[PDB]
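Objective 1.3, modelling of assemblies. Example input:
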Amino acid sequence: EVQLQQSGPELVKPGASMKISCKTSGYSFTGYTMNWVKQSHGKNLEWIGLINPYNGDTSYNQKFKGKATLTVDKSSSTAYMELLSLTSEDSAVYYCEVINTYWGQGTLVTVSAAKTTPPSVYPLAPGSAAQTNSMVTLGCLVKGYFPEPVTVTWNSGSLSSGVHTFPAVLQSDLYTLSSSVTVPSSTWPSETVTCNVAHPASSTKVDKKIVPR
Amino acid sequence: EVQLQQSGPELVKPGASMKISCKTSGYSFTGYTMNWVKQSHGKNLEWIGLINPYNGDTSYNQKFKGKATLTVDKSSSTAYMELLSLTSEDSAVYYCEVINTYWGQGTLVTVSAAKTTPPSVYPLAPGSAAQTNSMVTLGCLVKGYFPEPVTVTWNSGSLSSGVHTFPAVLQSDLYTLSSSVTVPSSTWPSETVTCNVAHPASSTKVDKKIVPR
Amino acid sequence: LKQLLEQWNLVIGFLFLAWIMLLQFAYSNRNRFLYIIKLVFLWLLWPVTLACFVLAAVYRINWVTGGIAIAMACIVGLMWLSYFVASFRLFARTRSMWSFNPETNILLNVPLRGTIVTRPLMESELVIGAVIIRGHLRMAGHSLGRCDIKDLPKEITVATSRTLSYYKLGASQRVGTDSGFAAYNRYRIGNY
Amino acid sequence: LKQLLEQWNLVIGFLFLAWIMLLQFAYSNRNRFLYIIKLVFLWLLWPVTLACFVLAAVYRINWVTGGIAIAMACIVGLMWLSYFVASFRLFARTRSMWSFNPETNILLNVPLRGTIVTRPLMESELVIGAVIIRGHLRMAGHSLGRCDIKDLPKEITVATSRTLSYYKLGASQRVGTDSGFAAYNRYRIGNY
Amino acid sequence: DIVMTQSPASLAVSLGQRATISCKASQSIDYDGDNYMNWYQQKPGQPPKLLIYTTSNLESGIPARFSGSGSGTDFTLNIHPVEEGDAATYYCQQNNEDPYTFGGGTKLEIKRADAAPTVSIFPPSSEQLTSGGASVVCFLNNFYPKDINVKWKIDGSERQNGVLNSWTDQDSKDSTYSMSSTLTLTKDEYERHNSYTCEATHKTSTSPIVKSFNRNEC
Amino acid sequence: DIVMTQSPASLAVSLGQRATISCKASQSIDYDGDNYMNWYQQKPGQPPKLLIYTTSNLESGIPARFSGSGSGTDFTLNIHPVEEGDAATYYCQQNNEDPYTFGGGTKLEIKRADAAPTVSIFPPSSEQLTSGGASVVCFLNNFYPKDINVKWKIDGSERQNGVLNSWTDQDSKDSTYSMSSTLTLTKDEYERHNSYTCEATHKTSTSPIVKSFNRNEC
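Predicted structure (tokens):
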């Protein structure tokens, strides 16, 4: 019914500024207040400020004052947060909420002098495993990408059951993702199984088929 | 918890008058309006009228004017209805209700000049029938009672299931009742089975055990 | 002397002041002792208004003013004459002194604490709400005294000079431990 | 100098008559036009009462009456100052016409039909009830216009000039065709 | 003064299927746009229970599977996921006009798979024979269809006199029925024929179930 | 700047048993006799949702198993019929003052029967070896409890160097854990060693699971 669509992730250097654009729908734009949260690294909720989209009348706490500007555009049913003088402690998942009920999906803000890199896809297969059990495990190593997120699924989202996805490990400022899926042995080599890797930050999309080796 | 406890069954002759009491509890009296309902033929519902327990203002339907009168006893938290000039068509169950959600048990009023007689209890068993299989049927016949409310229980309520109790029938102005219970051979004649027949109208209670003979 | 009319200025000064006080300190009913008094004042605005117009029909300046004063006095008479007709007819059905109020012709009856509490009701509709604040019941602007949510009546009635309505307790909820909320839905209509 | 000067009796006669009409053929806040007029009469009452005491002071029979009439006038006009200060402070926090009224210094704001509807509020409690009759929404004794139950606002606010309270829609129910019931509970308190 | 009726005098509905019961109000009750109508449910041996008030307000404690609506004169009760426990008589009431009349009721039965009866019989007791009378009683248990033809044939002769038949209501746990058929006679007539037979012809087979005993058997 | 704290850092609760989280406030709130306190729930990869508001008003859509109470400066969240789906982080919020604050967050873990890991070892891919370097990947699936010691050996010699370890969150259906261990090798030091072994030591066995492969097998 009520939506709070986010603009998606972005990467900037220290001292930079940005605007987080939230688009809503499903109800009259004005008449409800808007609230912002930071959720900094780790698992800690926090309050940034409140505004009234009808007429302004903003309110901030004493710690975030001067670090952000909260505004509104009534013509597009949107609300904005302007990030000022971003530093290393500002990396976080920012999002909008209305009445402690509806939340946006999260805008990932990364503050770092780092280069965006595409993933290298290295599919895994149980070569010479010589297994006689009614199960075969296959997977895929996705390495060298930056920044987060990277989306990795199987058979374009068709294969989800039996899939174990691990948190990416950060090494030398690049992320490595691990994923493994177990299927019945009757699936191989007869069926086609592919690993689908998408990394929007680098405009990279890869689709690799796994074969016996 | 709102409760309405009625006086119980009564028997009167044609042309007789009588009072039906209804003792209430669980809530303050002189509060909610009391309504009277007559159920006829065991099928149709009807409406007699209402009485306000605080201010003795009554309102009657149409055909019950001069046929029934309503009154209350505030000190005893008891409501009354008085039945006048009772005839053969006045036999019915009379209920008290408060706001259509709380109903009494029902007072059964019989209008008859017939004599009340005690029941005769005759046990049923497959004597010498050599029925030793998994389906052993035990039962009893109760005859010669009047006007209605004979209750038959098996083993003082121990045999709560497997019991088929039939509606009473009438012959020569007297009532009869049959019932039976299905038991395994493991309980017969290994256990004693007693039919508990209670007939309040004749102040009679008979506890009869079945003998396999 | 000139009729020492300064005395009439003092009388109206005090009479007007009474309304300034009542409408600032005796608002929203609340204390039954302020409400019952407020109802007295309004019953003494028909004889005051009338006296003003009648007096002007005696101490006339000209024929036009006299004629107007008389016509206006006549209208004020017809007001007091309805209040009396309406109040007696309501009393005939509901034998309570609450039938003689200068506000409305509808009474609300809510059973509480072993007795029945009666107050004037401004309008009769399908749904009547009820609010409990810190253990006290408020309905249709009136305070009906102390009542816990668990003890809230399962039935209330509304009476007029023509009909009688019965309202059944519907939904209810507890809010903040002591406070709470409920609503009553009309389920039965009677006559007289 | 030998004049009657009694025409003020017609003026006061009509003023009293106006009050009777307002409390008889209006009274209830059924629409904004009648409500606005009533608020004006409740305002003009201030200088009228004041004038009555002043005249007594000017034409005083003796020094006793003079001293009393003056003291009384000082109180009636001492209160008017208050009516103002309080209204000004409310206005300073908000930005609406309704901030100036003789009844209350608290405002209710309910978003409806693309805009926000504002009315004076004499409550400000933990729980606010709402009733919908035949598609119309009524709250706190005021008619807020047309509103179906399916579109009832999930958030309303109350401004007291010192604090700002936010209320959240709780349970609601339909009670026949296009009628129903709802209630709002405080969820948050902010300060000005 | 106001007639109110229900058309579907009897219903038969399988589990999980929708049941509908209609009612028509003769004088179109309407008070300021609101119609009034109350629906009740009654089980054997008990007072009626209120389900719905003012045409659509579901009584607290009543399962959501019960709903209803209407306008002016036409009102309907809808039970969507009909269950095996929904075997009761339903009624209507106005709650608007002076007499507050009731309409007639409708009876809802539950459909089930066919089943044959278990048959057992008893001889006269010693107490009855001592007293000077006699009786033979036949029980039919746990069958579904109600259409059973019970016969009392003695040495080829059908005995119509002295036979009573009592039926139970539909069982609330398994939707089955039971029957009790009793033959009443005097000792002087009992001690004549040697073989006593009870027969029941059912609708799930072409072979009637027969039980019998000999007076000299016990 | 109003500080709130929760007593437990985390809970370990078996199915069907009651779980409790308590919180204390430095301020009594006491607004017109009413205390304020909101409770929130958050899952991995998702924004939080509100469960309880103003100390005791259950949010719509939230099951009655969640019962909030308390007064003054003492607030408690009671979850009675704990189920397998109740695996989330719970938070507090005062919701009374301009500098609105939140609590630290308490993690709820669910107890379940012990289970051995399934161990599967993958050799380096041709693409990585061609480009230069090798990655040996060891997966441990569906085990409990979480505490497993995973070791790596090169030609029988333990090598703790170059090993990355990523852990999953407790599963929402089977309440199990999974682990992925990756060994990164250079291109030159890979071909000089032929035997690669991984060992998983779990609390459910006195005999660690050992899996291995040889470079010349694939």
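The two ends of chain C are 59 Å apart (CA to CA).
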